[PDB]
Amino acid sequence: PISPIETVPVKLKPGMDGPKVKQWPLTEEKIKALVEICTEMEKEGKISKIGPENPYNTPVFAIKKKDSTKWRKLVDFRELNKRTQDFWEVQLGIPHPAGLKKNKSVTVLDVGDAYFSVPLDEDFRKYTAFTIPSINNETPGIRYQYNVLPQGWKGSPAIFQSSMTKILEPFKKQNPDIVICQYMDDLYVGSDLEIGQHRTKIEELRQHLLRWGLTTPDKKHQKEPPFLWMGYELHPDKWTVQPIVLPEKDSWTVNDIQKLVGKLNWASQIYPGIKVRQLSKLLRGTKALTEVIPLTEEAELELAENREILKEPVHGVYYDPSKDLIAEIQKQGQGQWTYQIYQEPFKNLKTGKYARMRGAHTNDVKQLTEAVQKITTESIVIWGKTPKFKLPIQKETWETWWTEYWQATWIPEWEFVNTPPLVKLWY
């Protein structure tokens, strides 16, 4: 509900104590970044300094929300998040826009600003405590705590939630074709309009949100233009499924046949509809691997038709919303990275692919980081929930770099899976 210039009493879970998560050492430049940021936040009455009667502390990084001349503070309120939960007691009870993953254009506007206008309950403030590190331990660390709803805390949208609709209502009223579902910090405005127009509806909104006060910085490069490209205009309709496909041929060797058998024998864990023996006899006897063997008449069928058994999903179209959504990622060939997202082993709710080309996007880490943000953002669009990653990167390296090329304003949860030497075969 709305409380006018008054406080809204938040709290924690059953037996739950504030977070005591350790701060990670940053570089000299992320330090000063934050120092400039926070000092000003301090002057604007947003945050405040804290004595030692506060054992609490949640992590923080300095990423470039956008790689502009301007840096940005990114608080990692994950753990703080788990430990609080009294909210779905929200006024609405609608699930996630099952059609949003369907629209033509899904632009992502981030209203994290707003939040800094609501006072946090003096009582709960303490759990928001963060610490700006100090190079090489010379100084205790700098310590502030929030006085307003903090971005990323999975509870500020909920407080604010009422003011949202109250604002959105009009735009939604008139523009009733467009879907507007929000997640964590940003909104997800969708529609089937032809680009040129969509963009404006987004822009009308922006100008609307901004009209009432709720600032939006999410401005695309220019004023009001005409020629098309790839930005944060997610196009849900076009992102499709990169299936597991078999090769085509006029020179298949015994190895060739072999690998094939191996691969289909695997797919039978997903699509048990597969068959192979009539493609397994071709190898009867111990022949060279290089030997070339004509793909037989009765054989040529299997391969051919298994190539259709794959183009059709399995018995797992079922997403239990209260089960964890997991994502895996194999670093294929080069430049390319493939993925999957299941909730249960071998029944992927989706299998995609990521890639780019070494320009400034030179290394593995920035690639992976992007393939992550990518898979995550998709996921929020589809189930409105980020998956748990199983990144194929030594944690150290991931932990020292993961920030460098990050731009989102959420932190999924990851883990470091350590090895895929066959699953790499195009999952």
Partner 1 sequence: PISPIETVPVKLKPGMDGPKVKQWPLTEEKIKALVEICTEMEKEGKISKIGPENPYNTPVFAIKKKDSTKWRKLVDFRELNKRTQDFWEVQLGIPHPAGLKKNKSVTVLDVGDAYFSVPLDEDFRKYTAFTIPSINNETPGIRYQYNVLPQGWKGSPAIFQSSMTKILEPFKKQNPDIVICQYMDDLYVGSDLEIGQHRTKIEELRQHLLRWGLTTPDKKHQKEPPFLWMGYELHPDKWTVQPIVLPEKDSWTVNDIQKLVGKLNWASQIYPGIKVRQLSKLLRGTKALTEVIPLTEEAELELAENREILKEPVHGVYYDPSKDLIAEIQKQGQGQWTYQIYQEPFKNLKTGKYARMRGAHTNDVKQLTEAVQKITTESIVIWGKTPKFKLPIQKETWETWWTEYWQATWIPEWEFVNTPPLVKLWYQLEKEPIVGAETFYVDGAANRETKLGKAGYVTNKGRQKVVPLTNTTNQKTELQAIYLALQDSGLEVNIVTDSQYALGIIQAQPDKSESELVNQIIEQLIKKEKVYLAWVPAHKGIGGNEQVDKLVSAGIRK
# of chain residues touching partner 1 (CB under 8 A): 65
At residue 424, what are phi and psi to the nearest 5 degrees? Answer: -60, -15
The verdict on 260 binding partner 1 (CB under 8 A) reads no
Among 1, 4, 15, 52, binds partner 1 (CB under 8 A): 52
Residue from 255, 272, 300, 415 touching partner 1 (CB under 8 A): that is 255
One of 331, 350, 353, 374 touching partner 1 (CB under 8 A): 331
Which of residues 56 and 188 has its CB atom nearest to partner 1 in the complex?
56
Give the CA distances from residue 347 to residues 120, 238, 268, 313, in Å, rounded to whole numbers and listed in that order. Answer: 43, 22, 12, 9
Using the rule CB under 8 A, is 420 a contact of partner 1?
A: yes
Q: Based on CB atoms, which residue is closest to partner 1, 67 or 291?
A: 291
Judged by CB under 8 A, which of 67, 219, 363, 413 binds partner 1?
Answer: 363
Nearer to partner 1, 174 or 265 (CB): 265
Question: Rule CB under 8 A: which of 19-48 touch partner 1?
Answer: 25-29, 31
Task: Find the binding residues for partner 1 in span 271-300 (CB under 8 A).
Answer: 280, 283-291
For residue 55, state whether it binds partner 1 (rule: CB under 8 A). yes
* Closer residue to partner 1 in complex, CB, 98/135: 135
Q: Of residues 7, 39, 48, 54, which one binds partner 1 by CB under 8 A?
A: 54
- Give min distance, CB of 412 to partner 1, in A: 16
Interface positions, 115-154, toward partner 1 (CB under 8 A)? 129, 131, 135-141, 143
| Pair of tokens at residue 391 | 């990144």
CB of 282 to partner 1, least distance (A): 8
| 123 in a known ligand binding site | no
When the beta carbons of 136 and 222 are compared against partner 1, the nearer one is: 136
Consult the annotation and say whether 186 binds a ligand: yes
Q: Pattern of binders to partner 1 over 61-90, x per CB under 8 A? A: ------------------------------
Cβ at position 330, least distance to partner 1 in Å = 8
Distance of alpha carbon 152 from alpha carbon 122, whole angstroms: 18
Residues whose CB falls within 8 Å of the CB of residue 192, separated by 6 or more in sequence, listed in order: 103, 104, 105, 177
| Binding status of residue 396 toward partner 1 by CB under 8 A | yes
Tokens of 320: 């239990």
Q: Give least dist CB 22 to partner 1, A.
A: 9
Q: Which is nearer to partner 1, 235 or 395 (CB)?
A: 395
Among residues 36, 79, 113, 364, which is the contact residue for partner 1, using CB under 8 A? 364
Rounded Cα distance, 376 and 414, in Å: 11
Q: Which of residues 230-249 bind partner 1 (CB under 8 A)?
A: none
The annotation places the binding site for Mg(2+) at 110, 185-186
Binding site for partner 1 (CB under 8 A): 25-29, 31, 50-57, 129, 131, 135-141, 143, 253, 255, 258-259, 261-262, 265, 280, 283-291, 330-331, 334, 363-368, 391-394, 396-401, 419-422, 424
